[PDB]
């Protein structure tokens, strides 16, 4: 008996792709691309910070401009996503048989 | 058929330190 049809009114949305850029957190992290990371043994981030200065009068007891070298250590992590296929579909995706 | 490899000299300098006082972290390489 059974007969099928598809309404055009709406569409169910199977799970929706979410970019990470569109979210709020994206602010907190500037994100760049290592073409490779894991090959690194250890790494660091190097940058300079002057110390600000305030001029004063009077016989100058002390001061001199100051730099800093701040270096902080990368932390390697990783994400894992499982995926599976039976042989039922492999032939189809493959091609002709012997 | 000999192979020639350029010698490599590795040294690091902090020229700006002379221009100004600095207090760099020990671990980091200036």
């Amino acid at each position: 008996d059974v007969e099928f049809d598809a309404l055009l009114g709406s569409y169910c949305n199977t799970l929706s792709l979410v970019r990470f850029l569109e979210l709020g957190l994206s602010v907190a992290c500037v994100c760049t691309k290592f073409p490779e990371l894991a090959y690194m043994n250890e790494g660091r981030v190097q940058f300079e910070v002057h110390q600000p200065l305030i001029a004063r009068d009077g016989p100058h007891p002390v001061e001199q401009p100051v730099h800093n070298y701040m270096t902080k250590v990368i932390d390697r992590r990783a994400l894992n996503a499982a995926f599976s296929l039976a042989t039922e579909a492999i032939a189809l995706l493959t091609g002709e048989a012997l | 058929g000999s192979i020639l490899s350029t010698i490599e000299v590795a040294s690091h300098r902090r020229l700006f330190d002379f221009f100004a006082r600095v207090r760099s972290d020990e671990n980091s390489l200036y």
Binding site: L21, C31, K33 | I3, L4, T6
Partner: protein, 45 residues
Amino acid sequence: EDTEADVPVTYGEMVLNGANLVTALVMRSLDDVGRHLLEMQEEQL
């Protein structure tokens, strides 16, 4: 104060600044070792 904001799209990239200088040759004067370096530097630019 507002609803629709702007967001960056493309990720930040990186550039190689400095490297070990390592080359070779098969013996062409003896300076070509030098000239080949500038060659192999001119690539990275």
